[PDB]
Design a binder for these strands. Structure first.
Ligand SMILES: [Mg+2]
Length: 755
RNA sequence: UUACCAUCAACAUGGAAACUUGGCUC
RNA sequence: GAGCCAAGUUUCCAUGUUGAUGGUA
């Protein structure tokens, strides 16, 4: 079905885009596999060899290193005898004619992209990582030996509107200090302690090589080897590093006394990739620059481009493309005529939602923030909390009394009935003293409602162990404060406000909600938390709405061992969720809405045709249970940018903007929603892909329901990017994966204990 | 770990095309 | 000859995560 979703609800917004329309007038593409037999690999020297033959291959070539594209229909299988122009050896190349590609094809998308990477190469922009950056517009920090290149993450894609060039104005941190120059500086710093200092600085530090443009993690540094030595290339051939770089890449290496960097490929090839530090350069903010206020503020104020500056950089790119004769010729020879200005459309702005409290219901302002409108009125349900204990190591004791004073001053308009705690001073600041004191306080007394601790500095092990005690071993709701958030009195008041709201959340109270027209709605939020350190011990959190007014969230956690499946884990989580829903609501829901987090574009069909059929196979375990299911793939980090056409320039878009045309994928029912208010930089929306819709949910109530679920998040009094169940599931899975490493207590799963 | 939002640095996973290798295989 | 599966390389991409900076509450 064709995607016609742009309805009348919401006001039209003239949105500029980071999209430039590309009109294609190609008539035939032919794809060949060049088969250089003595194995040249440079991606530019091979381009030079393919440009050496402009007669048989013509002057129009979309070459990329191993795949050639022609419009000329060259004969099947030919051979050529090119010259390497380096150290002398004739180069025997082949031609394959693998495929015939039609004009309007999605397999021409890599060919279009290769043409445009060549076009950016014709603007003298360097290729760093996977993007193109301009060193002419670079800004330099000489005090840190670093530069920022303003360039573009650009890619041609086929959306509903057709062929588009997505160009995001990215910035590349290019460190002028080489790795070899870093070893030179450290060797100047100390002599005997040079190698171990380079070991602790470099192992874990990740470098780039710009001659092939690849990033490698330094797993070790070998000081016993030097480029001069010899290694074996994949044709089983023994050659030195210098000869390999002067032949396969055409680079003469200045210094040959440099050591070697070993990158061990994880999740296994067993090949020690061996790296030269002359062509290896670090990427990232240096250690001395991290604590610099001026340098980081200049870097941040440059990279936090407003939509006016974003569109200005895109217009500069289009002006550079149009003014350069070679780039315009290269685009025109393929029939790819670029647009002079970026694409712009008319999106919709969704209406504001009445946030409801116990007695007051207020329409949200344009800021979409209710920070001060919720600490002046009462929450919907406020559980009174009297018996609790505050744990402090006598150094934040004044800060503890200040926090208690602010809490009892603010519990009035909040609605909490707050009693003074047990002021548990700790004889030591150790984790063992903390845990034994909490356990001894709860061992004798069973009427204690809460345990609130104060942590000296940033201690992740102490917070993790406190949460290990509090929602696994002894199910007591917990709260952890730092001394940096209650020290100064300037922000102490709002900190105490949100802390008391957190106390009300972790006890089963309800903070705020909106009116929802959909009845018996069964909201599911999931976030498959992947572990890159525990041997792929994936954690799937599961947050399920329970009451009809969409305010109680029953939580579940399932762990995935190696060689397991998400199927039975989601089976157990869903049957537990419907068991809780039946035991509370005394009914069964007619509509289950699932918000799956983190699915790539390739795994979308895998999610749609494999996992969700088993999700409806869970449904037969109950008595004639067949409701209507709606599954969402949520993609938060995207590269599409929305602008707002003010009558002078481009500004940040108003929060709550939907785009359901011209950007969406062809094979799915998609839209982009910018729900949150953003004041820094450009407002990235969040991609919302309908994997399945059995409820016949039109995109009017679909977008409105996702926007409404963006409001329900109770750890922030305003709109967040993802919906509230996605963020609840993400925090639950993060706490059960990196902090708990265990399933929680079932009773504490009745409340938002992870907030 | 009082939160949310931006952008940067990196890692990990997955898809499509082409090619190569090794098994089957009609 | 055609087809299936596994692994790898090169192109194009997509998604998540961890840090680090800022902002404001
Ligand atoms: Mg999530």
């Amino acid at each position: 079905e064709l995607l016609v979703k742009q309805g009348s609800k919401g006001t039209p917004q003239s949105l500029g885009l980071n999209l430039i329309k590309i009109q294609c007038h190609n008539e035939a593409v032919y794809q060949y596999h060049v088969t250089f037999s003595p194995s040249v690999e440079c991606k530019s020297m091979r381009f030079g060899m393919l440009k050496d033959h402009q007669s048989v291959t013509g002057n129009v070539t979309a070459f990329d290193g191993s795949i050639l594209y022609l419009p000329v229909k060259l004969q099947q299988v030919v051979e050529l005898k090119s010259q390497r122009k380096t150290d002398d050896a004739e180069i025997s190349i082949k031609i394959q004619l693998t495929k015939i590609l039609e004009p309007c094809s999605d397999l021409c998308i890599p060919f279009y992209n290769v043409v445009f990477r060549r076009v950016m190469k014709l603007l003298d922009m360097k290729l760093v990582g996977r993007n193109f950056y301009d060193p002419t517009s670079a800004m330099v920090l000489q005090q840190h030996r670093l530069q920022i290149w303003p360039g573009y993450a650009a890619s041609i894609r086929r959306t509903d509107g057709g062929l588009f060039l997505l160009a995001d104005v990215s910035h590349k941190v290019i460190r002028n200090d080489s790795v070899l120059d870093v070893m030179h500086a450290i060797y100047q710093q100390n002599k005997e302690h040079f190698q171990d200092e380079c070991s602790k600085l470099l192992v874990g530090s990740i470098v780039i090589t710009r001659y092939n443009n690849r990033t490698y993690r330094i797993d070790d540094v070998d000081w016993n080897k030097t480029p001069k030595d010899s290694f074996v290339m994949s044709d089983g051939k023994e050659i030195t590093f210098l000869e390999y770089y002067s032949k396969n890449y055409g680079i003469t290496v200045k210094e040959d006394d440099q050591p070697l960097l070993i990158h061990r490929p994880s999740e296994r090839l067993k090949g020690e990739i061996l790296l030269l530090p002359e062509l290896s350069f670090m990427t990232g903010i240096p250690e001395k620059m991290k604590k610099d206020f001026r340098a980081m503020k200049d870097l941040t104020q440059q990279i936090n481009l407003s939509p006016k500056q974003h569109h200005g950089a895109l217009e500069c790119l289009l002006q550079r493309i149009s003014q350069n004769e070679t780039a315009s010729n290269e685009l025109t020879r393929w029939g790819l005529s670029l647009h002079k200005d970026v694409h712009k459309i008319e999106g919709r702005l969704l209406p504001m939602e009445r946030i409801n409290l116990r007695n007051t219901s207020f329409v949200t302002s344009e800021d979409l923030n209710w920070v001060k409108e919720v600490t002046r009125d009462a929450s919907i349900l406020t559980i009174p909390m009297h018996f609790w204990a505050l744990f402090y190591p006598k150094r934040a004791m004044d800060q503890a009394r200040e926090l208690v004073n602010m809490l009892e001053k603010i519990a009035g308009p909040i609605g909490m009935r707050i009693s003074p705690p047990a002021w548990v001073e700790l004889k030591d600041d150790r984790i063992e003293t903390y845990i034994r004191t909490i356990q001894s306080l709860l061992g004798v007394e069973g009427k204690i409602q809460m345990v609130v601790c104060i942590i000296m500095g940033t201690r992740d092990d102490l917070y993790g162990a406190i949460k290990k005690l509090c929602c696994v071993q002894s199910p007591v709701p917990s709260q952890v404060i730092n001394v940096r958030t209650i020290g100064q009195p300037t922000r102490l008041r709002s900190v105490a406000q949100k802390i008391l709201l957190q106390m009300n959340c972790k006890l089963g109270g309800e903070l705020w909600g909106v009116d929802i027209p959909l009845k018996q709605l069964m909201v599911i939020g999931m976030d498959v938390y992947h572990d890159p350190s525990r041997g792929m011990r994936s954690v799937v959190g599961f947050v399920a709405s329970i009451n009809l007014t969409l305010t109680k969230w029953y939580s579940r956690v399932v762990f995935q061992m190696p060689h397991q499946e998400i199927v039975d884990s989601l089976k157990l989580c869903l049957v537990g969720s419907l068991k809780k829903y039946y035991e509370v609501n005394h009914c069964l829901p007619e509509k289950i809405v699932v918000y799956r987090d983190g699915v790539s574009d390739g795994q979308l069909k895998t999610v749609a045709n494999y996992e969700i059929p088993q999700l409806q196979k869970c449904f037969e375990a109950f008595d004639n249970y067949h409701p209507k299911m709606v599954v969402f793939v949520v993609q938060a980090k995207i590269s599409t940018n929305l602008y707002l056409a003010a009558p002078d320039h481009f500004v940040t878009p108003s929060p709550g903007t939907v785009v359901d045309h011209t950007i969406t994928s062809c094979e799915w029912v998609d839209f982009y929603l910018l729900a949150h208010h953003v004041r820094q930089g450009c407002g990235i929306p969040t991609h919302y892909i309908c994997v399945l819709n059995t409820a016949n949910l039109s995109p009017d109530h679909m977008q409105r329901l996702t926007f409404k679920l963006c409001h329900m998040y109770w750890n922030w009094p305003g709109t967040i990017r993802v919906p509230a169940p996605c963020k609840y599931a993400h925090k639950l899975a993060f706490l059960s994966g990196q902090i708990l490493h265990h399933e929680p207590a079932i009773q504490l799963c009745g409340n938002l204990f992870f907030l």
